[PDB]
Symmetry: C5
Subunit: 277 residues, 5 copies
């Protein structure tokens, strides 16, 4: 016999330099208030009369979700040569409520005739998330520059046919929840140095949606220089859009269906040369 | 000539500190008793008259399966500073009966006309499993808050339109086999620190199902800190749902079809600082 | 200049290692090469009702199995140890994939009478196993009220429980072309001495997808680094390769199967005598 | 004790390394930003016959190309060695993917007149290239009897041989919006100093699939560890990104393209003088 | 300061032990000669009257392509203990002309009605290539043993229903360009020890084709014992078939469409015990 090591499991608090935050963001499909009958869906998609006359109704346009998480205060003021900042190092993220689509009794269009189940949510899907130290920077680009956007969303200013491609004047920040339409704004790849974003799109009229869920997967947020998003003003920005498809009603009107997203982000305190003038 | 080693194969007992458990869980599609004619399927899916009037018939809603496996007793009592616990380290799992779908003579809707084979099981699929040291923690989220759920399932209490998104009040434990509907409950990603879960969904009205099977794949259950699920009260929780799709009858009525899942979990004895007060 | 090595290629293997090659022809229902429809089932006859569902003989695709006798290792079976063949790897391929690339075979038309004919499509099921004893099977059916014909092995005393997993419904894959695919699947609770791999895609008319290469080897070693051990010096090769169904002009349908090739490497091992 | 601590700060990369960024707008046929259908083709007009197939002006998607002038490296060009920029890696993204998530744009209805409109779908073609000279093209067409419009670069003296690979049908991607996608592909027999990557999915009505992230870098070094070398200090960026077709209510169809962003990292290298 | 190395880039010729060859193989769908109007396509697919009466017209059957490339001569003396052989160690290969399918104006069946684009090439696809030191060895297997094959293709001798499965007598060598039908012959996995082959099939009546192209990808040809194909008689065999799908005419007649394949093969000289 001899003295030797044995590993005992116990509750461990990590070091003071590490923190984790959790949040969820509910979808902003157009009915964005929990009291609304169609919360989590858009209103019925109204289609253009013509190219020139294309005026989506209020609440028919899915928008990005964003939350700003206030992190623990690190500095007394911004006067020193170096400051402390939170660096986001990894994220675990999940789309919540996927199983809710496994439902063929909800009223709608029938799969076959009136004795069958109803058609589930299907068609175009769009799933993206971002984690950054400032708002996600957006680029405007639309299917049609002659669409008239509702007052209650943020559209491209002074739209022209050039906005059917990439016009460098069409820029915005994702700084408001449920206001920036998915069909108008995409992540700006010429910026976003301090954000990590990931997106998947599948189109088609009636395409089957595909989604995974697990609590086993972590995404590392460090860039090619080994540095994660640095949280300006001790704020963490979480952004997403999770359009599962459209639901079709018996009359063939259609509404977009979105799902919430969960985030768990790990951050560490870093010494940073002070960027604030 | 020299003395040297040769490796002889033999029946080896594992260390006393390691055990394996095997179990299977039969599906709970609605007909949940083996004596029922439609065991392994739901009853015919009855669709809503309207948003306001949507009352799924008894036994038409697939539910999660759960089994609690009692493991060998490790402690005389719970009074010491440390205790022994079983830690789940890996799982091999398989969906059983996949080949039963390779059947075009079962009565149903014809692929072409009356001389052809019948349409096989297809449409929405949902496959998930979990292995944990306590019940899987669930989040409620539904397609429609105005559905009336049957008495024999566990539904969200005081359901409101907010339940079409994520409401943090809508929480449950998967603590009853064949009682928690798939379309109401999903894993809660904000909890489940002591469970590992994995899920895959594909929707669509008539989508071909895709399934693999092999006895060559092991999934490691250790988390990011190298710790597997720790079995509270010497109990192992195995959870799953395996909806293969729907079978369509000649009359075009439709029933969900589920399949059983097999689990083989390897566990090891660990010394753990006593969690019980 | 100096003495040094150069690698010369030549024909070469040790007596402790052997390779076996085999092919298994499909057993779709027409299982004898003299049959007109060899490699296909007979026309799929569908159920009148749940209660009345009587598949005609040879309309049910079955698993293939071959038992390969390996070189005899022990003249004496009474020592502390015996020798056994351990299967360590397999190369396997579905043969005849290119035969589906045929739009002139008579059948249902893709468009009208001027177009090509619909190729084999619909449900596919591809699996293989390599083991040192019969593949162990679990019975599970779509409908317990089907009446299976007397030329196939089906579940004994079938009941509604057999639409799920009933632990009494067990069998060994020990007869070529007699165990229906739709009745039997690998039993994951056993098969410690077999490795199996399977892929299924359903749907009424789904396009089949298959690859073929001679570049891929599958290692058969389990989590303890041990391959299947061939009891009585016998190697068991099992498979099913259903490519889809062929549709005739009258809309009757037949299952189409393809052969599978195996190349298994084995090594002699010393094993403690049971 | 004295020890290290890692402080984060802005670092300017070595003088030997530079990054450039650029975007290239799609050239689907309406290639001028003032045009109503900018980012789309004009309505696809189909052949009357094999012999009479004359696509209208601006109905043919063409490749995009941009030449990026890098910092001048060499005062004297008669020296034994020279400096050149070597492209080592690229980050690239298709911009405006989310613009397709739009079911109110006027067109064909998914179901009836109460439903959303069919989104962009059908054939897709996504490719990019990063090189130190123009992308070298091979001509190959579906039909040698098509008459191409004056405003595009077609195969010279086109003959039925051009429905396969004729080594006389070669070009350089040296003009933006002039080389039709359906006439020209990358020439795999050349392009030693370019890296190209392409993905095609066909079909009449196929759902488009596209990913977007800022987390992915592609390494441009070849099997000898060498990236594209920028001749005359010019970097060539090429692409085509056809998202599918939009279908109008009258059933006329137009190609839809999307822009592509490039971020390329380059390093100065000593190169023996050609 | 000090003496040190700097890596200068220059044109380097490989060592004499290594060579690279490039080749392209044009498709052999039935119209196999460049002067033919439908070069790169089959003739219209004529369907069987019945199982017993199934007679595909000449040049309606896509066939494998093959090229035999003569490598540098290695042995003037074939009687020593050893000989030199070229060993194929890697290949870069690409399907050419993928972009030609991105064409909705070619005459044919309409996607919707007469105002829409025309249906592009779709349906069954079959893409394979092989690199070997001798002809690809083939196994015969057909959908129907009662088909009558034309005299301008090599088919199974004395065909019987057994040929709807694997009959070991049904064997051939891919030794003629454009004469061995894809629907009759597949690689023989029981042979081909001196060839590497790779193939992908997707069936279905109207399936969208999927193809990739890049010059960044190399496939290693070394087998499980670390040995690539050895080129007998200093000949390299390149084989392929690349059926992209079918084109449908307005009358609904259908033709197979094939595409060319490019090969770039790297080989090294090896000492080999003289057979
Ligand atoms: C996304 C969703 O819940 N859609 C509902 C739909 C909406 O409530 C409605 O379209 C919003 O205006 O309602 C559906 O049920 C309808 C009944 O509520 C109504 O009394 O009568 C309608 C007759 O066409 C219809 O049955 C629907 O529009 O199909 C059900 C659907 O789930
Ligand atoms: C999943 C399954 O077994 N479905 C059966 C189905 C059910 O047994 C039934 O719908 C539950 O009440 O029955 C099917 O066959 C039917 C006959 O049993 C009945 O005598 O007549 C029906 C006339 O439409 C029908 O043929 C069915 O509904 O198609 C067979 C099916 O596999
Ligand atoms: C798999 C196969 O070869 N199928 C054949 C089919 C078979 O002979 C059998 O019927 C399948 O169960 O026969 C097909 O050809 C038929 C003629 O042989 C017969 O003279 O008349 C039929 C007219 O409806 C038909 O043309 C078929 O049923 O289409 C051809 C098919 O390839
Ligand atoms: C790609 C695109 O934006 N297509 C438009 C289309 C085009 O503006 C036009 O076909 C090309 O010059 O126009 C669509 O709307 C049309 C109206 O502009 C017109 O007043 O009436 C048409 C009646 O059939 C039609 O409604 C179209 O063709 O559907 C809308 C489409 O987004
Ligand atoms: Ca920038
Ligand atoms: Ca939590
Ligand atoms: Ca067991
Ligand atoms: Ca060349
Ligand atoms: Ca052999
Ligand atoms: Cl703007
Ligand atoms: Cl609740
Ligand atoms: Cl039994
Ligand atoms: Cl030319
Ligand atoms: Cl022969």
């Amino acid at each position: 016999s001899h003295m030797g090591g044995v590993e005992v499991l116990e509750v461990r608090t990590g070091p003071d330099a590490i923190t984790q935050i959790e949040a969820y963001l509910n979808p902003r499909m157009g009915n964005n208030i929990p009291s609304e009958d169609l919360y989590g869906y858009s209103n019925s998609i109204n289609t253009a009369f013509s190219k020139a006359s294309d005026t989506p109704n209020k609440d028919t346009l899915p928008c990005y979700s964003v939350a700003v998480i206030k992190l623990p205060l690190l500095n007394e003021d911004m006067t020193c040569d170096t400051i402390l900042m939170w660096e986001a190092v990894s994220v675990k993220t999940e789309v919540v409520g996927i199983s809710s689509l496994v439902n063929l009794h909800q009223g709608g269009k029938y799969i076959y005739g009136s004795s069958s189940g109803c058609v589930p949510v299907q068609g175009t899907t769009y799933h993206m998330f971002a984690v950054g130290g400032e708002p996600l920077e957006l680029q405007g680009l639309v299917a049609s520059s002659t669409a008239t956007y509702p007052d209650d969303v943020v559209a491209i200013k002074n739209m022209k046919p050039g906005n059917q491609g990439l016009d460098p004047k069409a820029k915005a920040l994702l700084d408001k929840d449920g206001k920036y339409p998915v069909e108008v704004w995409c992540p700006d790849p010429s910026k976003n140095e301090n954000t990590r974003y990931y997106g998947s799109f599948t189109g088609g009229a009636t395409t089957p949606p595909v989604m995974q869920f697990t609590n086993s997967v972590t995404t590392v947020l460090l860039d090619e220089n080994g540095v994660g998003p640095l949280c300006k003003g001790d704020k963490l920005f979480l952004s997403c859009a999770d359009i599962a498809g459209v639901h079709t009603n018996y009359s063939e009107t259609q509404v977009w269906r979105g799902l919430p997203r969960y985030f768990n982000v790990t951050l560490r305190k870093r010494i940073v040369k002070n960027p604030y003038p």
